[PDB]
Paper text:
Initially, crystals that grew within three weeks diffracted to approximately 2.20 Å resolution and the Bravais lattice belonged to the orthorhombic crystal system P212121. The YiuA crystals that belonged to this crystal system had unit-cell parameters a = 41, b = 95, c = 172 Å and will be referred to as crystal form 1. In crystal form 1, the two YiuA molecules pack orthogonally in the asymmetric unit with few intermolecular contacts near the base of the amino-terminal lobe of one molecule and the junction between the α-helical backbone and amino-terminal lobe of the other molecule. These intermolecular contacts do not involve helix 5. The final refinement of both YiuA crystal form models revealed several amino-acid Ramachandran outliers. Higher values of each statistic indicate stronger structural similarity and higher quality alignment between the subject and each query. The results from aligning each model with the YiuA crystal form 1 model are summarized in Fig. 2(c), and show that YiuA is most structurally similar to cluster A-2 SBPs and least structurally similar to cluster D-4 SBPs. The total solvent-accessible surface area (SASA) of one molecule in YiuA crystal form 1 is 14 481 Å2 and the cavity SASA is 2682 Å2. Based on these measurements, the dimensions of the YiuA cavity resemble the dimensions of the HmuT cavity, which accommodates a hemin complex, and are considerably larger than the YfeA cavity, which accommodates a metal ion. Atomic distance measurements between the Glu109 and Glu228 C∊ atoms, delineating the base of the cavity, increase from 36.7 Å in crystal form 1 to 40.8 Å in crystal form 2.
Yersinia iron-uptake (Yiu) locus encodes an ABC transporter that is Fur-regulated and has been shown to restore the growth of an enterobactin-deficient mutant strain of Escherichia coli under iron-chelated conditions in vitro. In this report, we document the atomic three-dimensional apo structure of the Yiu SBP YiuA. Structural alignment analysis reveals that YiuA has the greatest degree of structural similarity to cluster A-2 SBPs, which bind chelated metal.
Numbering used by the authors: 1 to 77, 81 to 101, 108 to 188, 192 to 346
Write the structure that this text describes.
Amino acid sequence: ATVTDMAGRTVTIPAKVERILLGEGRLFYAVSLLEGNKPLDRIVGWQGDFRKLDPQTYAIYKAKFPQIDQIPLIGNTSISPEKVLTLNPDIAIFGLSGSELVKQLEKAGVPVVFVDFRNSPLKNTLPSMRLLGKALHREQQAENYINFYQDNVDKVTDITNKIPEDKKPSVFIELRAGACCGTAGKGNMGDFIDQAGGNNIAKNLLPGSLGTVNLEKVLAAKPDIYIASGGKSPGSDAPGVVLGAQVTPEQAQASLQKILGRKGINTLSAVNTGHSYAIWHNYYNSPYNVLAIQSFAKWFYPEQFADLDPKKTMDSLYSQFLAVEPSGTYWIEA
Ligand SMILES: [Cl-]
Ligand code: NA
């Protein structure tokens, strides 16, 4: 009847939950692990980020669940309402930031539950999933995913927790690489570099999980490994790495060569020797991020993780927890 969410708030959990509001649409990723073969049946409204900013994954779901388009889009605009109480929701899910709708929902006695996959994903990913298991009456499903997640993160931290600091390769990840050089320090994808045995150039070169750092000159740190994140669609014309549910290995590869073609970056040692990589950006706010930890690791220590196939982890994730087929490309090499 009560949970403590990742904001420390105490929240009563109604006995019946069938109408879920998503205050950030891409919280569908977390919900989708709990919902089995009926991923949309309980979403009565979401903020539009998932439909508009991950159109590739959305389209995969549309092809199988056409009713996805009628799920109302919460916003002020394109958006379909912004007075959610008329959806009579049982519960609402938000991510921690790093607001007004939340206070209004409290007044009406709607339980608002805060999760977090973005600020401190190492600390918060599994507590957020167990929290959602409790608040949405999917405890066994949450625990199932937690064991799958823990077992697949163990496959990595079993090896990289015993690696000396001098052997750790230096790593710079460029977030949203196309706008230079925004990154993550103590947190967000920094956690994934930490878990995967790497040394993040910006690990304390900024006091926070997300931020932007000085341009590519500070990449005279000669990182052993280069990593760019993006989730643009093919033919987008808008600059950025091209990854997602509808991207081919070749289409991903052509976008990475071009991002590695920019000035300065094409002088880095990791670029001209084949140590450059691209990762799906939505791993930065999603409990699927285990796939990015495993991808980082296999890149950082190839010989030591040569038995570890992240595509096989992903196939097993979809097989066990999701209603759609794995498609597209979410990481790529150079
Ligand atoms: Cl974003
Ligand atoms: Na999905």
